[PDB]
């Protein structure tokens, strides 16, 4: 029923950074986890996903090499470590509940989100 | 397709508005299209469970590739971006933009 | 997931969580005794079926279409364990009886005087 | 089952196992009855464990049979005698055989312990 | 304990003895009998989760940590008594037991993921 993105780790272009997210008021395991981010002056789009009910994961082609996704289900937490930030990577990354414990995913809810600098 | 979102279909004069427009191969592929919306400088909230479900503030529908979200007239409260997205083979299709006003 | 965390999950998904003051004196003894009896009853039954120590027992008793005529792609993916238990609440004691007969037949065959082990 | 013959009655070993488990004056009498049933169940299971049989209905072992106990062929006792009759024919001896079963298992456990055959 | 830290070859006597070889009095006697049963079962349950059901000795897949002894095998076996040994490692009992539980869980996750059929 609640989630919050960790403050984004600001970084220079092509530098490493890592995202983290906390879950609350939920099992934070039955539901799948997902990340999406809005670039400045743009709608958000999926960057990565984690099969939180399992150890499987998937990523958008755009960040297939640049970003990780994982669900620390044991800690009611999730993360998305990243490297080689695109200069155009200063997007606000939101956490989302993709639900689909059994079937039929959708982004059911979003965290407030945070953007890392992609320049310094 | 980036939901073929209209740049500003949800942008309207007070008390009346057009349905937000959407179109995608992903919407045609499965009935897994849905709407989400956000106030300026805010995270999105689901606007619909599906293009054809839980359309509580205003009605919504889909027709294979095509999809739309009816406007709640043009209540000031309706002045939020109206993004369209749909499940894909991996991840989902997302609207590039969805400007709104009321 | 924790205890009963998988209760709302499908049967398939849930398979991964199987590893998870005189009157007073009388009441406390009754509670202790029952806890022991329930423990031992499950162990005796798994023992009789010949798979004690396992969370998943593979048996040699065929499934009867009478008990359920649904296929695996429906049972494991389109149902929860609570729903399944209701579906086969009837015949549960039959399945259990057949499992007991099978294990006893197996152990007997194994000690046969002509073809032992 | 008690009315049949050994080896035929062997096909009913499970039904004979599953029926072994389940005002302060009355409350104590009933708790004593429940506790005693548990003690007896566990005593038999522990003993099967000690002999090296454990959670099985039928176990072979490493203790030979001889005439001292009973000079019968398998054809005479199996299918031509009731378990009740057998229990009477080999009454006595039971405590000797039980002692031998334990000793045999102690040696078997010792053989594995001494051999140190591991990964 | 009764001797050196050498393994004893007689283990079954200790085990068989566990199962047993004025209203308030009756309650106290039932409590004593019930507890003897509970203690018996707790040891059996603990062995079961380590994959030791039915055995008087188990080789496991948990390595011994140097922080639990800082001694080699020759400094323990036939050097110490069982009571001395038990005292020396009394601060690691829960650690070792936890590791044994985890090792068995991994072994059981395997097998489950790779069941053998007909």
């Amino acid at each position: 029923x609640x989630x919050x993105x960790x403050x984004x780790x600001x970084x220079x272009x092509x530098x490493x950074x890592x995202x983290x997210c906390x879950x609350x008021x939920x099992x934070x395991x039955x539901x799948x986890x997902x990340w999406x981010x809005x670039x400045x002056x743009x709608x958000x789009x999926x960057x990565x996903x984690x099969x939180x009910x399992x150890x499987x994961x998937x990523x958008x082609x755009x960040x297939x090499x640049x970003x990780x996704x994982x669900x620390x289900x044991x800690x009611x937490x999730x993360x998305x470590x990243x490297x080689x930030x695109x200069x155009x990577x200063x997007x606000x990354x939101x956490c989302x509940x993709x639900x689909x414990x059994x079937x039929x995913x959708x982004x059911x809810x979003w965290x407030x989100x945070x953007x890392x600098x992609x320049x310094x | 397709x980036x939901x073929x979102x209209x740049x500003x279909x949800x942008x309207x004069x007070x008390x009346x508005x057009x349905x937000x427009x959407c179109x995608x191969x992903x919407x045609x592929x499965x009935x897994x299209x849905x709407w989400x919306x956000x106030x300026x400088x805010x995270x999105x909230x689901x606007x619909x469970x599906x293009x054809x479900x839980x359309x509580x503030x205003x009605x919504x529908x889909x027709x294979x590739x095509x999809x739309x979200x009816x406007x709640x007239x043009x209540x000031x409260x309706x002045x939020x971006x109206x993004x369209c997205x749909x499940x894909x083979x991996x991840x989902x299709x997302f609207x590039x933009x969805x400007x709104x006003x009321x | 997931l924790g205890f009963l965390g998988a209760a709302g999950s499908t049967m398939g998904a849930a398979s991964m969580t199987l590893t998870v003051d005189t009157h007073w004196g009388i009441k406390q003894l009754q509670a202790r005794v029952l806890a022991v009896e329930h423990y031992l009853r499950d162990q005796q039954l798994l023992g009789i079926w010949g798979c004690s120590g396992k969370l998943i027992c593979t048996t040699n008793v065929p499934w009867n279409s009478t008990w359920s005529n649904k296929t695996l792609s429906e049972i494991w993916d389109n149902m929860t364990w609570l729903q399944w238990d209701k579906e086969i609440s009837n015949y549960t004691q039959i399945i259990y009886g057949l499992l007991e007969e099978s294990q006893n037949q197996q152990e007997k065959n194994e000690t046969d005087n002509l073809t032992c082990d | 089952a008690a009315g049949s013959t050994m080896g035929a009655a062997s096909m009913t070993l499970t039904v004979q196992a599953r029926n072994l488990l389940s005002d302060t004056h009355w409350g104590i009498k009933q708790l004593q009855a429940r506790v005693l049933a548990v003690e007896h169940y566990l005593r038999d299971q522990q003993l099967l464990g000690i002999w090296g049989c454990s959670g099985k209905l039928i176990c072979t072992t490493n203790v030979p049979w001889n005439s001292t106990w009973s000079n019968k062929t398998l054809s005479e006792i199996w299918d031509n005698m009731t378990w009740l009759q057998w229990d009477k024919e080999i009454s006595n001896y039971t405590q000797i055989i039980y002692g031998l079963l334990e000793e045999s298992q102690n040696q078997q456990e010792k053989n594995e312990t001494d051999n140190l055959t591991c990964d | 304990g009764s001797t050196m830290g050498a393994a004893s070859m007689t283990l079954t006597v200790q085990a068989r003895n566990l199962l047993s070889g004025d209203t308030h009095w009756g309650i106290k006697q039932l409590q004593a009998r019930v507890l003897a049963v509970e203690h018996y079962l707790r040891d059996q349950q603990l062995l079961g989760i380590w994959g030791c059901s039915g055995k008087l000795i188990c080789t496991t897949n948990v390595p011994w940590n140097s922080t639990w002894s800082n001694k080699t095998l020759s400094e323990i076996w036939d050097n110490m008594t069982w009571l001395q040994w038990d005292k020396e490692i009394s601060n690691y009992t829960q650690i070792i037991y936890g590791l044994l539980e985890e090792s068995q869980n991994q072994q059981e996750k395997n097998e489950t993921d790779n069941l053998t059929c007909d």
Partner: protein
Amino acid sequence: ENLWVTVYYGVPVWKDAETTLFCASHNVWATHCCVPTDPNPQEIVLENVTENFNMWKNNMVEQMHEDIISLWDQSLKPCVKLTPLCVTLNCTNATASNSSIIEGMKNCSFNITTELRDKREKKNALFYKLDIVQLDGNSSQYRLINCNTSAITQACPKVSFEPIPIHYCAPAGFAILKCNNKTFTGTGPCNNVSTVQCTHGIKPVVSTQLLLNGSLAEGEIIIRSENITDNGKTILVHLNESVKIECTRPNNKTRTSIRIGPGQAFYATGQVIGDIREAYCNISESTWNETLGKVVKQLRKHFPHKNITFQPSSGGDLEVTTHSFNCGGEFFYCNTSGLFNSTWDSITLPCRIKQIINMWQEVGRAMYAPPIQGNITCVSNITGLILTRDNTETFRPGGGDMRDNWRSELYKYKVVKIEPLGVAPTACKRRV
């Protein structure tokens, strides 16, 4: 042969045993024996099983005996004590339906403490002569018969003691074997045995001479004794046909009360309206003679010279010389000498009534039976007789210490302990 020991578990064998049995069923019996019965009880026939049953050594009787006595004590315990009545009573002849012609009753007046401890009140009640003992010669001063030994407890007319069938059930690990031989005499082997978990349900009916409301023999009349030759033994005659008996007290009693403490009250007898014959029992004619006809015919198999004589009980306390029974809560003591009086449309026996009851075999645990208002009629079935024996043979309507009433049905049942382990040789050795 090259045979090896094979260990078996779940072997269908047993050993004789005595264990704790439990019951299955405002009534005391229902309250204690609170456990429900199996709506569809099972019975398994054990073909080719021979088992030795011995009713005279059957400990199910002892367990029944102890549970019944224990239940009565627990039931009576949380009730009114009558200690306050151990005062001198001023007893004179009671008025009957007309004038002072009623025998067996006295009108007793006394000074008893009221709810308040600082006041005494003059109260009175009618009492039966059998419950009252005179304090001195030539005197109106009397006391209750119990005050010499113990205080007594009133039975609360809140709880019914009416017998219902009680099913005795074995615990897990145990079973009850039942004898299905219609001519079984109580001590030999039964060649037709079945196994049950619970007994058929025995009504805990209490009587001293004639056994009432039991099950009739499936076969002919069976004479059962531990030793028929030995005089110092009870002979139980189990009838195959019942004899109907009707018992009554055609007099409307008044139930009134005396307060003795804070919610404590004694139930006293007031004026009684009706006859003065008190109680009596009707046994059908040419029914009793026929029944005895059949019984003697069977006794002659042990006593072939005939000369069989039936005499009244030779003597002793009222409780052993009369036929005692509980009729709707009232305790009757019927003469019976009109039945047991012969050498080779109805007959009635006079009956007396008592309120202070020395239960079972012990004086000092006595109960006070409150009066029952209005009149009473009981109907019951005589299902068996208890005889004792003394160039002729004499039988008496003697009796035992309750155990013999229960060991009338618990003769078909035996408790055995299941013993799941055993060994036998096979041709296969264990291998690694």
